[PDB]
Symmetry: C3
Subunit: 298 residues, 3 copies
């Protein structure tokens, strides 16, 4: 895209503020930002806020979201589709033109770990170029295992293809499959979908802890066989809905856009790989690391 | 196949009649019928009854099916395998030769949304060429959410490959991935697996309704990440068995041949896309539309 | 690998012995062994014990495994990762050098049907070349349907690619997808992942029996749509954990490394194919047979 040549829009922080007991404002951007998805490999991503996947959104069950998208892309329209919400797609997930903003309001009625993504046609193109992310909706009544959890992180799986190549997006294997982690609490890492950061800077935990991961496989195209090496998931809540409760799973199958809350115990010090067990994808980047120490700091 | 050149056997209605409180007769054909799977693209499909996927079959839990296949294909044997039934495959799912009929009897003991398909070797060839469909077995005791459902439809996902090309069937990506809808009640649409009909003639619903979809991904080869844009599944019954009850799923993973009953509420007027969230497949056709109006008519 | 030319190390029996009420010794090898994966097609597999998938391991919930790997590979290190266990991957799943042994101890706290595999980088290479298998951990309190089961077998699905070809492993479709069966009781077959043995020597059962299969799809790369033709799964326990209990499934989606206990009734004499319903994979080998006779012997 000629108007994207040389464009690298600096990341912009997500803006969120609660405006009522059940109402939250969220403002994101759509912007074009260079991301190093593998060493030496820059992808001029189509993004929300200069991150791919985009910034984490967390709201409470029953919050209505008053969402503004500021489209900084000089030429391509963009939009926002939150899987969390009940909305009219043709009214509420509509395009915002370059250099314009749009505001849309819709409720997040359901707890869980939801994909969000750009909804502009061709949706595959917008997702594959980077416009994906997660919104977590916290259950009003929690999860039954909340009191057992010592630490928690968010992980997202996505693929990267040949740059803005619709044929490859439709018909080709992913060039990279990657994890990223998005911060829930101050000091948590906040990374983009790349093949290396969560290997070189593992997530941290302490021996004996029960870890919760909020996970989503945003695709665009692949399913995920999510597995933590050296442990078993004590409890899994499919899509993060507390009712969808499995126990003792070695691996959690996630459809494209599928989410889960998974919990597991790390019993010994060491480094625990986190993979999709579709090992072609793991080999192409989709291995993160959890470093478990006696203290929980590196 | 030389004997299929120029062959386009007009669709024949499914014939079904109840012959006892727990016994039903079904007669289908196997026939060769041109189907427009994408605009300008005719596939000379191997079909049941001139539809691909084939006609919907609905029976009650505990019905024994006395099934007749009339093979109108001039040269290729065909057969029928219902995933609903308990049967001896080597006695009851056997081939019916060209211009012959065969009758087989077997019980549908289990509620759900089952694939049916031709079972003639190579099965991949018979399925990929179009010989797939759904049989719904209605649970004797219903689903616990039956009283909440306002409207219901059947959707089927399938792929199309290069024409009768076993190498492509085995080793190639699908050229198209498509939805079709099969009528449950008079006035429901009844369509074939194509890239456009359910976009141009969306399924219809009314604002505020809870919609049930009986869905099956017949493949032949892909899994499906089934998602309705703008809503969340309130309730999901995997394979349509009432016991396999999930709640609040954004997306339902369906194996190849996998079924589900999914229910969701449409809260606002508009058009709601229905996708597999494996967006390569969506881009290659697998987007249907649900048009939600204040009245429920177009 | 030059040092593997001409190498065909004869299979070595798994060695296991109970050493305490909750402690078991297991000794395996890593070895290079020619396996006929399709007729006329020898794969010089990287294996545990000269089998691919490797030998079945069965332990009880709560057993600690004192595992020794004797690496007979003349040049490549190998390791063992049991999905059943809680272990430090970087201490307990570490490499054993050629002509050395290593012993590692870890508990199997969780019931189910777990993948095991070599964990040596690149893991994809070690798995794809054959270093995969299943460990079953028997639940202390059984499964609620135990008393209904008449007969049981273990089946494993795996893929085979072009020989030791990392590009193909990462980016190519599988050349073969196969089932094997591993013996639970004397007289059960014990086979390797190939396209033909379980067609030519079907598993055996008797009319009217309820069959349990312990299944795992070890991949490396594909998911599995596991289906038995002519029946429906009465009960399914995902990953073999008794809590993850589905009923009346036609087909069970297994992620890569995913396991299940599935149970079904065979009501009539005949031969019942067992497939992954991703029919490209079935066509490329992944069809096993269950021969059901009035007596249960051939
Ligand atoms: Cl692993
Ligand atoms: Cl979508
Ligand atoms: Cl089948
Ligand atoms: Cu507001
Ligand atoms: Cu966009
Ligand atoms: Cu593993
Ligand atoms: Cu009759
Ligand atoms: Cu046929
Ligand atoms: Cu979506
Ligand atoms: Cu010992
Ligand atoms: Cu190895
Ligand atoms: Cu089938
Ligand atoms: Na591992
Ligand atoms: Na969408
Ligand atoms: Na079949």
């Amino acid at each position: 895209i000629a108007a994207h040549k040389g464009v690298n829009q600096a990341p912009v922080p997500l803006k969120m503020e609660r405006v009522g007991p059940h109402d939250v404002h969220i403002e994101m951007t759509a912007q074009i930002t260079d991301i190093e998805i593998d060493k030496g490999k820059i992808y001029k991503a189509w993004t929300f806020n200069g991150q791919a996947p985009g910034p984490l959104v967390v709201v409470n069950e029953g919050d209505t979201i008053h969402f503004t998208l500021k489209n900084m892309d000089p030429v391509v329209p963009h939009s926002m589709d939150f899987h969390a919400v009940h909305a009219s797609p043709s009214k509420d997930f509509i395009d915002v033109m370059p250099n314009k903003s749009g505001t849309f309001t819709y409720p997040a009625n359901k707890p869980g770990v939801f994909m969000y993504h750009c909804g502009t046609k061709p949706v595959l193109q917008h997702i594959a170029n980077g416009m994906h992310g997660v919104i977590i909706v916290k259950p009003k009544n929690g999860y039954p295992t909340d009191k057992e959890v010592d630490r928690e992180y968010v992980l997202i799986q996505n693929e990267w293809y040949k740059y803005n190549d619709m044929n490859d997006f439709q018909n080709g294997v992913p060039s990279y499959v990657v994890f990223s982690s998005k911060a829930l609490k101050p000091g948590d890492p906040n990374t983009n979908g790349d093949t290396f950061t969560l290997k070189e800077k593992p997530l941290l935990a302490k021996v004996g802890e029960k870890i919760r991961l909020y996970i989503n496989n945003v695709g665009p195209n692949e399913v995920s066989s999510f597995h933590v090496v050296g442990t078993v998931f004590d409890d899994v809540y499919l899509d993060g809905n507390p009712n969808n409760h499995l126990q003792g799973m070695q691996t959690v199958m996630l459809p494209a856009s599928g989410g889960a809350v998974v919990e597991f115990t790390v019993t010994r010090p060491g480094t625990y790989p986190i993979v999709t067990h579709q090992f072609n994808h793991a080999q192409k980047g989709a291995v993160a690391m959890l470093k478990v120490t006696e203290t929980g700091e590196d």
